[PDB]
Short mmCIF file of C-alpha atoms and ligand atoms in Angstrom, two decimals:
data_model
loop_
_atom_site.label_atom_id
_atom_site.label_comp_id
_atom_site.label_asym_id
_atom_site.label_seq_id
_atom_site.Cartn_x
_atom_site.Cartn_y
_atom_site.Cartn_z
CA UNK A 3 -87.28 122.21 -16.77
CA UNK A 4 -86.43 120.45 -13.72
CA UNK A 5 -89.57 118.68 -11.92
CA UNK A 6 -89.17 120.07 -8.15
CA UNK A 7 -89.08 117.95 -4.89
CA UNK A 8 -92.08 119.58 -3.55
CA UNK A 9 -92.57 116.96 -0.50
CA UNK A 10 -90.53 114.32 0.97
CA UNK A 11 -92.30 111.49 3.56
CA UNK A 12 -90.91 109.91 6.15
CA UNK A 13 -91.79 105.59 6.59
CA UNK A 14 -94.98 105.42 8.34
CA UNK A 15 -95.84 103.20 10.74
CA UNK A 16 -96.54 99.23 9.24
CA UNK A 17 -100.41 97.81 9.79
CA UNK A 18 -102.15 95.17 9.33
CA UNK A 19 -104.31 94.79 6.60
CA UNK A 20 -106.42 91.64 7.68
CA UNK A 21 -103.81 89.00 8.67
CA UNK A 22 -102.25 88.26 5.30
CA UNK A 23 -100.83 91.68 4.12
CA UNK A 24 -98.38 93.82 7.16
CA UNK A 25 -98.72 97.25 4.85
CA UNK A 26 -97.00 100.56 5.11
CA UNK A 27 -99.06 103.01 3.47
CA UNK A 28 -97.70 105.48 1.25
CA UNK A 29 -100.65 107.82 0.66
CA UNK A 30 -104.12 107.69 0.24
CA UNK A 31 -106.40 110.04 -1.93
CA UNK A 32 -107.98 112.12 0.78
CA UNK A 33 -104.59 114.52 1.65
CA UNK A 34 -102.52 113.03 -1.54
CA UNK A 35 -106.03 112.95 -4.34
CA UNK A 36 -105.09 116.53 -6.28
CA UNK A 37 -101.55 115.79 -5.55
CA UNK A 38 -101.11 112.23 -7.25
CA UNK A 39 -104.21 111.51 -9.52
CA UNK A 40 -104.51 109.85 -10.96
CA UNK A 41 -102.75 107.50 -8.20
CA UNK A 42 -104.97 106.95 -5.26
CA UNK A 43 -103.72 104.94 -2.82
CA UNK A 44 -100.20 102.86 -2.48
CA UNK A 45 -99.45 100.00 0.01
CA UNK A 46 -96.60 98.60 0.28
CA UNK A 47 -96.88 95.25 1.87
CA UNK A 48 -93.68 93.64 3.81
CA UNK A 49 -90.85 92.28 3.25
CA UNK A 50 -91.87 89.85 5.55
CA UNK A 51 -91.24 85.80 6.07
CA UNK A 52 -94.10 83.80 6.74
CA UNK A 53 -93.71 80.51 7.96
CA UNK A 54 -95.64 77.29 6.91
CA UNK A 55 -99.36 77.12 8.15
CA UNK A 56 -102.44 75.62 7.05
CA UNK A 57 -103.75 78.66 7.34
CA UNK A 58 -105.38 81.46 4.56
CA UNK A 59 -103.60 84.38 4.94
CA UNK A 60 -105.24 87.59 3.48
CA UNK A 61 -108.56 89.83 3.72
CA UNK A 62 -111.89 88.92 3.25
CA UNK A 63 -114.38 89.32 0.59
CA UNK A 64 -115.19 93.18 0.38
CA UNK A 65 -116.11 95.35 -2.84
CA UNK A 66 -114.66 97.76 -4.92
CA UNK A 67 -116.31 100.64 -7.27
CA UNK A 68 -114.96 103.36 -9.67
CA UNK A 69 -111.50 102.05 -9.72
CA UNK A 70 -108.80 99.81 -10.23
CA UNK A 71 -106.86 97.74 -7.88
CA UNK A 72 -102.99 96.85 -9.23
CA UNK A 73 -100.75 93.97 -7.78
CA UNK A 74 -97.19 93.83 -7.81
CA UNK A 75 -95.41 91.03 -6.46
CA UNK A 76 -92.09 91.34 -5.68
CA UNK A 77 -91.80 87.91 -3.31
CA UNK A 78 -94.26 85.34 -2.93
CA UNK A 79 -97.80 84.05 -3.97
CA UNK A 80 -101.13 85.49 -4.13
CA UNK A 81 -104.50 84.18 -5.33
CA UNK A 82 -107.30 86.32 -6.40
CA UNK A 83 -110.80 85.77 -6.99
CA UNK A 84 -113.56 88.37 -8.29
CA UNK A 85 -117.45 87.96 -8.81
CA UNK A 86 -116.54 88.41 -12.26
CA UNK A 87 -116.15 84.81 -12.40
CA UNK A 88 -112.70 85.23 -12.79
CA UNK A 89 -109.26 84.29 -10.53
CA UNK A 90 -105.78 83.41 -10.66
CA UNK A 91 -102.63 82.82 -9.05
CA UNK A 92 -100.02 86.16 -9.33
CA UNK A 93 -95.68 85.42 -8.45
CA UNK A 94 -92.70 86.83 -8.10
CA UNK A 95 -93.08 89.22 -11.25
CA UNK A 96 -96.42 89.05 -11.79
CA UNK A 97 -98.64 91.84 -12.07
CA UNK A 98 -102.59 92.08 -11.51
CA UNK A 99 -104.34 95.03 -12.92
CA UNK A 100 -108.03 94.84 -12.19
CA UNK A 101 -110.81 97.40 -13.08
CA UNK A 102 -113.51 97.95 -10.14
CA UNK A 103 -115.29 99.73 -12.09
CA UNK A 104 -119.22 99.36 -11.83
CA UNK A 105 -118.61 97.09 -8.70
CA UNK A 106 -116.20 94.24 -8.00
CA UNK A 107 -116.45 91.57 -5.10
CA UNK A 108 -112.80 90.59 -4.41
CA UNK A 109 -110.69 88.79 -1.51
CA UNK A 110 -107.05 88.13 -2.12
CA UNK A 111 -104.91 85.83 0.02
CA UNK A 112 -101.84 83.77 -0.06
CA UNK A 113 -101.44 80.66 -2.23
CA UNK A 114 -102.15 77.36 -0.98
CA UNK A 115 -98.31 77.11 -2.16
CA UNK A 116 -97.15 79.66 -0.21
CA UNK A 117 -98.91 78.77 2.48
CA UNK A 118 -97.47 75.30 2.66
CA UNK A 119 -93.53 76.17 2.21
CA UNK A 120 -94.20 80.11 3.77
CA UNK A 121 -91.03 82.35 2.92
CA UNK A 122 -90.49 85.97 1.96
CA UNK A 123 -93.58 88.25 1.56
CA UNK A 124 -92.98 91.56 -0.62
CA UNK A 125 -95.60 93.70 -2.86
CA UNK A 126 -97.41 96.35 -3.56
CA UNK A 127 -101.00 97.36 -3.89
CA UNK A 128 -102.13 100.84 -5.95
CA UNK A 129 -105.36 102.23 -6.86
CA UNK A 130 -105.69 103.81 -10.07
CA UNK A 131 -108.78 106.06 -10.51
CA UNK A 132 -111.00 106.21 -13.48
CA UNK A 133 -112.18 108.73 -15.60
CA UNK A 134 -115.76 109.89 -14.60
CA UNK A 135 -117.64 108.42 -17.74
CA UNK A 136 -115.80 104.81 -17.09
CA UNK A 137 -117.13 105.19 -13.08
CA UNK A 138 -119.11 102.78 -13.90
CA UNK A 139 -117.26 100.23 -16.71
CA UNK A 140 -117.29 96.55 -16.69
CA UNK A 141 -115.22 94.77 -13.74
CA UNK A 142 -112.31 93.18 -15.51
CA UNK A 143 -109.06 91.85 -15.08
CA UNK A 144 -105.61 91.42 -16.52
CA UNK A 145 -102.89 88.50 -15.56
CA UNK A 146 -99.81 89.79 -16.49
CA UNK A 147 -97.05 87.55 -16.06
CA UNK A 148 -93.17 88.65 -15.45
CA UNK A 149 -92.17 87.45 -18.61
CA UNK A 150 -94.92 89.81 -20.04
CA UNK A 151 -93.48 93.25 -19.10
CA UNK A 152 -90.62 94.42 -20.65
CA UNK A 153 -87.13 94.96 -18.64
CA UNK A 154 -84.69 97.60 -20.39
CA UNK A 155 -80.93 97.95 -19.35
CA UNK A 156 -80.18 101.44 -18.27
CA UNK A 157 -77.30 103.32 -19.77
CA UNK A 158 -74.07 102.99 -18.28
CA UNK A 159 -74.78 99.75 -16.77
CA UNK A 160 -76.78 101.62 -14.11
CA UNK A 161 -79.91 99.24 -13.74
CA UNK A 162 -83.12 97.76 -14.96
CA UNK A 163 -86.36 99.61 -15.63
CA UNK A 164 -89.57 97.51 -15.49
CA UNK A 165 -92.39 99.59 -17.56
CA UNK A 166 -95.89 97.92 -15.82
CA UNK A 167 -97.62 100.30 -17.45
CA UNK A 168 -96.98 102.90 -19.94
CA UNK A 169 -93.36 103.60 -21.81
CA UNK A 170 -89.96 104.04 -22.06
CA UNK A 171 -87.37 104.04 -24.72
CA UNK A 172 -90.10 102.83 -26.96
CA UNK A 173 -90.91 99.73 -24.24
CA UNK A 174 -94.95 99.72 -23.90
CA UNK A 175 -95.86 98.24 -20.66
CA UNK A 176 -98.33 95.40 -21.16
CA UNK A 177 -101.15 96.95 -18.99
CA UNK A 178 -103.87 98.88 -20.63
CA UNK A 179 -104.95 101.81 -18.70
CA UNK A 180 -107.84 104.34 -19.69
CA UNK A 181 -105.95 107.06 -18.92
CA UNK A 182 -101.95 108.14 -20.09
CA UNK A 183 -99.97 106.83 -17.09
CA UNK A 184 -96.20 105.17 -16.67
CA UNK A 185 -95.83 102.65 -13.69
CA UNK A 186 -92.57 102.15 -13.79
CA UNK A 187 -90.18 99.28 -11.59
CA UNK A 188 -86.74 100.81 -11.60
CA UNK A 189 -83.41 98.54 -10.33
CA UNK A 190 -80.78 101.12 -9.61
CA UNK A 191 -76.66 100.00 -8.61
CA UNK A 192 -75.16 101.67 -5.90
CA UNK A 193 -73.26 104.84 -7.96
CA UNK A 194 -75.31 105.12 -10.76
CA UNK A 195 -76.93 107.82 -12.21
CA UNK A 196 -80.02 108.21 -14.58
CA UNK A 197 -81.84 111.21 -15.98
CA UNK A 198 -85.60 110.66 -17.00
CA UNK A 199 -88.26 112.98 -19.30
CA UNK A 200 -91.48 113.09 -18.05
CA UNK A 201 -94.50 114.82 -19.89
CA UNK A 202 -95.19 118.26 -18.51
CA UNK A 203 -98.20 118.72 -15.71
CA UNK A 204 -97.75 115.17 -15.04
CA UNK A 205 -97.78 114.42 -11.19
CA UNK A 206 -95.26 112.57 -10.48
CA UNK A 207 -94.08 110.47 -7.67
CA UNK A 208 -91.02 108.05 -6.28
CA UNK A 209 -90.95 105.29 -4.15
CA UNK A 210 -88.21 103.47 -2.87
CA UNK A 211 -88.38 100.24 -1.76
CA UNK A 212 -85.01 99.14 -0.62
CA UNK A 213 -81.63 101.19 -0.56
CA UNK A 214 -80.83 105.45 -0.81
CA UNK A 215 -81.56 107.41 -3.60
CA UNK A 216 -80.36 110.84 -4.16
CA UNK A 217 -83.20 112.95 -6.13
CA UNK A 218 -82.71 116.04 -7.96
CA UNK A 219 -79.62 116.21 -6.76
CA UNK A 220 -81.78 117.46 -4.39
CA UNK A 221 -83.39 114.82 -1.94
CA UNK A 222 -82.10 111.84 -0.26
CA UNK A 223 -85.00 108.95 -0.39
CA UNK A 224 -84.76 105.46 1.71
CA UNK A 225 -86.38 102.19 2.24
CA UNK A 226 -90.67 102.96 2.69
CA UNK A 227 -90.35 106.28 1.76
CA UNK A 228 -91.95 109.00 -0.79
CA UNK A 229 -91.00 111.60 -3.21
CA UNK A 230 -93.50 113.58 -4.50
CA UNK A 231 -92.51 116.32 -7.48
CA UNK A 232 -93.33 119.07 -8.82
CA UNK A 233 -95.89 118.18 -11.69
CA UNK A 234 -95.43 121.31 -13.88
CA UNK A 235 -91.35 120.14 -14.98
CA UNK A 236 -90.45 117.84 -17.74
CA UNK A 237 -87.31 115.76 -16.40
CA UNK A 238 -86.14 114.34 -13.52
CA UNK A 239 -82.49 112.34 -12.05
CA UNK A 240 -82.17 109.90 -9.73
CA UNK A 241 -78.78 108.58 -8.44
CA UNK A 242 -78.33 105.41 -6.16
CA UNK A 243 -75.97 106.03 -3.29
CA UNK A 244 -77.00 101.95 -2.75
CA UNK A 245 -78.49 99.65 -4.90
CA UNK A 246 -82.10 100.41 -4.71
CA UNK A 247 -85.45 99.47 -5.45
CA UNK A 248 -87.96 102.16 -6.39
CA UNK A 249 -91.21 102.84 -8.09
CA UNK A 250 -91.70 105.46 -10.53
CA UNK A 251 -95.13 106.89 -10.91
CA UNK A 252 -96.60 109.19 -13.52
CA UNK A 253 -99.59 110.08 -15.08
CA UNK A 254 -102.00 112.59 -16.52
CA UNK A 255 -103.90 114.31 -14.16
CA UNK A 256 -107.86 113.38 -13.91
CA UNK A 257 -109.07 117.32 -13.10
CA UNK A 258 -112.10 115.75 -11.68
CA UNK A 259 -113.89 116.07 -8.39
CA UNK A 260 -113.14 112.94 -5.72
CA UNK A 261 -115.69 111.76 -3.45
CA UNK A 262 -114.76 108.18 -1.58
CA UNK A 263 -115.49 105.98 1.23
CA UNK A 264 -113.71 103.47 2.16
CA UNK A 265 -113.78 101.21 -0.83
CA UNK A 266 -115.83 103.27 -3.42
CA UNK A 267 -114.20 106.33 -4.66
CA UNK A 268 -116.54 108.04 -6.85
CA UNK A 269 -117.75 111.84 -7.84
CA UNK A 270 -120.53 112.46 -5.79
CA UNK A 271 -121.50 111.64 -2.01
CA UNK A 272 -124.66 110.70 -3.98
CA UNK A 273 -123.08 108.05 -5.71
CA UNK A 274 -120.83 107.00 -2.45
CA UNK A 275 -124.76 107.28 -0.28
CA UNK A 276 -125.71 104.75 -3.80
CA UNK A 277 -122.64 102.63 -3.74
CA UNK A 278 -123.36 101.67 0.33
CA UNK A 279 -126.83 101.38 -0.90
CA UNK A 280 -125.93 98.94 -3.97
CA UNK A 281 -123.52 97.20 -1.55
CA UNK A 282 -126.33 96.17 1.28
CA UNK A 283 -128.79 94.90 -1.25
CA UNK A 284 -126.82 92.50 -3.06
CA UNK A 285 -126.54 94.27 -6.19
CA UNK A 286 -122.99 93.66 -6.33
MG1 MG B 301 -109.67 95.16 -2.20
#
């Protein structure tokens, strides 16, 4: 049960996310929300070098509701804060994985660090929606360091797997999730082969980052751009005509309605017309 290329994407155009994070985005909810929950949004921010300034690099303070924000660095360093009292530094490796939830009040930017030696900028930013009764759950976080996540071989010496979140050949990514989901950071060498299992009605997408991937036998997939399956298949193959980076993302469906704005995704335009309302009043 093979799951289908049903849509293929071609690299957008790169923007500017404030002036920290050049971003080409992969999807967003409102034409991609049935097709990738429960996914909703991916950027994928450079490469690109940044030389030394004195500088802050990023995006302002802005809030979040009814969802959660992941960070995956590939190069460089970026410092979060929340209103949750909490912050933190996140590398080459490192993984953020923080729940909106209720509300959040967030800016990220680059590292004093990296702002005083500058060098090669790389990662990506998905949103992860929640389950309707955890709308509105407690803002947390998670720091999960590279050393955290597990990194299996492939078979035939065809790459690494990263699981961020979920599992693989009985590998449990470190990041809790409230909702069955793989994020997976795949390594593949140019002429390599891999076959994957996938549970059935999962949407499922892939994302490569650097180098030409061959899916299905089916597909060819390069640098910035998207594969999006067929969700009612099982298994899936992916073979590297070059060494490439890609993302792997899965997950149970959320068969829930979507209503967002900007940065609250919610149910109901009620609770998007109460979000802007808890936003102006300070209740954030
Ligand atoms: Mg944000």
């Amino acid at each position: 049960a093979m799951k289908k290329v049903q849509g293929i994407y071609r690299a957008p155009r790169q923007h500017w996310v404030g002036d920290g994070f050049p971003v080409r985005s992969m999807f967003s909810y409102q034409s991609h929300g049935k097709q990738l929950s429960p996914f909703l949004l991916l950027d994928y921010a450079g490469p690109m070098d940044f030389t030394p300034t004195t500088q802050r690099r990023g995006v302002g303070q802005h809030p979040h509701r009814g969802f959660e924000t992941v960070t995956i660095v590939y190069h460089g360093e970026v410092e979060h804060r929340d209103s949750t009292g909490n912050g933190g530094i996140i590398g080459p490796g490192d993984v953020q994985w923080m729940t909106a939830g209720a509300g959040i009040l967030h800016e990220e930017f680059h590292s004093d660090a990296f702002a005083q030696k500058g060098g090669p900028f790389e990662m990506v930013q998905l949103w992860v929606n929640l389950p309707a009764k955890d709308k509105m759950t407690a803002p947390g976080y998670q720091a999960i360091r590279r050393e955290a996540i597990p990194q299996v071989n492939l078979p035939d010496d065809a790459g690494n797997l990263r699981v961020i979140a979920g599992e693989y050949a009985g590998n449990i990514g470190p990041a809790k999730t409230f909702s069955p989901l793989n994020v997976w950071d795949i390594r593949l060498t140019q002429g390599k082969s891999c076959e994957f299992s996938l549970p059935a009605g999962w949407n499922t997408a892939l994302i490569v980052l650097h180098g030409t991937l061959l899916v299905n036998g089916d597909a060819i997939a390069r640098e910035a751009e998207m594969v999006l399956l067929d969700p009612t298949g099982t298994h899936l193959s992916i073979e590297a005509n070059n060494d490439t980076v890609l993302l792997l993302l899965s997950g149970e469906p959320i068969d829930e309605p979507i209503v967002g704005y900007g940065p609250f995704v919610m149910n109901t335009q009620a609770q998007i017309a109460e979000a802007i309302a808890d936003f102006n009043g300070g209740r954030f």
